[PDB]
Design a protein around this ligand. Structure first.
Ligand SMILES: CSc1ccccc1CC(=O)N1C[C@H](C(N)=O)C[C@H](C(N)=O)C1
Ligand SMILES: [Zn+2]
Length: 139
């Protein structure tokens, strides 16, 4: 679980969005596993606008932060799951690091701000949905 709170927006994994997220929907994209809902309170986070490929992410299944080197956002095949058919997920960045399904929502940050959230993983891999291209999150 986890979310980004920026301005009057809440960014979550689309597959973990609540009934309240859908009732306050701003934008969603199944191919990216992202959903953005509106909030009444002002957020605590800021978004990176950069091309960093290193950063630190929070791993709830270890209660720890880990440093990572990750690939640039790209179209990657993700096998069928409880929430999606087998498909290509876009804007996904992979890295070597521990993750389990419940780690989705953990934030990845670089020196410039929030980069994205955990969205996929595997046998010693962790994948992050990028948010740096969503320029409208800052206005
Ligand atoms: C950190 S996730 C992880 C980690 C280790 C091993 C397996 C996973 C699960 C994972 O990769 N999923 C893909 C995700 C998606 N973005 O399509 C939907 C997730 C779901 N709950 O249906 C399953
Ligand atoms: Zn950066």
């Amino acid at each position: 679980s986890g979310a980004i709170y920026v301005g009057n927006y809440r960014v979550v994994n689309r597959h973990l969005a609540t009934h309240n997220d859908w009732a306050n929907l701003v934008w969603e994209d199944s191919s990216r596993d992202l959903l953005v809902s509106s909030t009444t309170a002002q957020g605590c986070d800021t978004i990176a606008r950069c091309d960093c490929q290193t950063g630190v992410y929070y791993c709830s299944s270890r209660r720890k932060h880990y440093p990572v080197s990750f690939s640039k956002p790209s179209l990657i095949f993700v096998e069928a799951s409880e929430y999606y058919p087998a498909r290509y997920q876009s804007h996904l960045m992979l890295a070597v690091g521990h993750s389990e399904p419940g780690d989705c929502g953990g934030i990845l940050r670089c020196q410039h701000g929030v980069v994205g959230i955990v969205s996929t993983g595997g046998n010693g891999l962790v994948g992050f949905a990028d948010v740096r291209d969503l320029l409208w999150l800052d206005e």
